[model samples]
Target: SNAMLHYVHVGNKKSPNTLLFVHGSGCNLKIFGELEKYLEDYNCILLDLKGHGESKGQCPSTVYGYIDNVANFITNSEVTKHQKNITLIGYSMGGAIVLGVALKKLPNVRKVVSLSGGARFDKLDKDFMEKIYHNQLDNNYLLECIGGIDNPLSEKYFETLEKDPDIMINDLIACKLIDLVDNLKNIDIPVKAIVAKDELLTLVEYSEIIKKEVENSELKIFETGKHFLLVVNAKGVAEEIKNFI
Candidate 1:
């Protein structure tokens, strides 16, 4: 049986356009708290995939599994019953999952926005996987991987991370193994990709690749912010989404 993903709605329910947010690995819907504040005009749905936050269930071990779960949520959830012009907004791994869902050609989906996400994550090395498996990495290193210690949301974002090391490890492995580059061209919907120039996790080149491979796509590269640009530069990203959809 498919587990029901936990989600919360913010903003006007009667809005014509709906923005569904999918957060990155090890993080939860709370990551969008500040971002949501800037997007109060439109309907915003923030969700915690199974095993991420208040959602209680084993997390999916593969990116395809996540894609399936999210697609199910958008298609079957009661909160999305009135969804008109739907836009999928994703962060990091959530980006990849949204793009994959778009490929499914869901009827109401009008566009997709990828925040520090990519079509492929093959760049992650075996050594990194080994380190994660051996418990060599801590939350501090993971935080730095997204943004530096100086980021404003460092402490608060850290508090939103998955406490169980195993769940985080599985998500990382799923990210490393995901291969959607070959399938990107199949996505016919409009794609707006946003990434930071200093991004460490999903490199800026990945967003460029998305622009290159997808026919109807645009990319915006931020000189500041790192992997966690969604929060670090929430207003900037929210502005782009407002302009796009």
Candidate 2:
């Protein structure tokens, strides 16, 4: 499953600490360009989830495809030269995948960071995404899904998104299946949720739900920002990550 997935790594090669980044739907690992700079002290491993970026293969319609691919990376020395305490940093839909991995209690996973994400995405949008995934709607409709036009991250999002609609379509299906609120107890790792009150899609309340349900979790709300706060204000978010870890 992970055979075709693409990963970009940078940082102190000898460092015992590792931070693995998983990008959200419609985008690839490249979005972490700035965020990676903030956490540059650690060994960073960024991946383009199943269908996005340089990844190839029949995108699996289930979330397991994502959870498994990431699992393979850590379990096998996919990072042969690197190994140590691992922390997963996920954005948007990527947050959901990291939580799912934590639920399985993998030994290497020490903590989880959910940036601009939630555990239970509102069930109300399921039907609409189904329609979009089937090629019934123009993909540009997602351009407004995250931050505003002035938010540099959203501009990159627009470019990467229109590049391939199929990858995001599969992401939509898997996103619908993500419901970790009630089952947060299954995951034993510490989880931190960062959200923006002004976010267009995933709101602050979603992050609150995660902080409330996940036993060992913390929540932070950005007074100013749309959905892509991590990208728009990378240094701020990175500071929080440093303070927490």
Candidate 3:
């Protein structure tokens, strides 16, 4: 529970606000490697949630575990010394984590950008995400289709998963069970939901739910992408964020 959360900082430390990047499931801070260069204006801090990268701990098997890890890091991180204004950019599971933090602990967070994340988990096709979490396919199949080790950063991600597959699997299951529709109205800051074109079964439908529940929320869809659009379209996404900030 006292695991060290790993983070990479970028840009001028003297900037007025800090941009915090949180990656999706089965990923580490390096998932944002391609997007970091585009955001050179404000101070950026990319974190590897517990058990995702160089951080020490088993992958969390429950939503509370993920929330606790984030809450712990925020309340006791060196980045807090820099500035109070924080912007959270989260992808997939990381997006859910951002919502949890912003709504529960990180009161200073100014804006929340969730890419390919929905408020309702029941909408996700049970089979698709489960396959990735369970590692059901053979090694050869996994290497080709999963894209878990397709890039430099992915290698580290696989290493982390290998270190603790059970916890990671449980974490995925936990993520699927989480629903925050009732609490969206509690957030007073602006929320931007980015949905992918080739998304899972009900992502678009759920995005609308989020938009309807949160008074200060807007929805955007990426026409040519999937769940990992943040990485696939890092430059464009970064620009959108730059403009939003």
> Clash totals for all models, in order?
0, 0, 0
Pairs that collide, model 2: none
Which stretch of 10 consecutive residues in model 1 shows the poorest summed lDDT? 135-144
Query: What C-alpha lDDT values do all the predictions have?
Result: 0.86, 0.76, 0.70
lDDT of 2 by residue, 99-213 (tens): 8878877787889999987776774255567686676544344445554567666576456542666666667667777777888877788999988787756778888888988
Writing each residue's lDDT as its tens digit, candidate 3 over 71-190 gives 777777867643688888887777777777768746667888877776667855556566856655234433433344555544544443334545445555777878887888887888
User: Model 2, residue 1: what's the lDDT?
Assistant: 55
Candidate 2: regions farther than 4 A off? 1-4, 80-82, 123-134, 137-141
User: Model 1, 154-174: lDDT tens per residue?
Assistant: 557767777777877888878
Candidate 1 residue pairs that clash: none
Which residue pairs collide in model 3, if any?
none
Best by TM-score: 1
Please tell me which predicted candidate would have the highest lDDT against the true structure.
Answer: 1
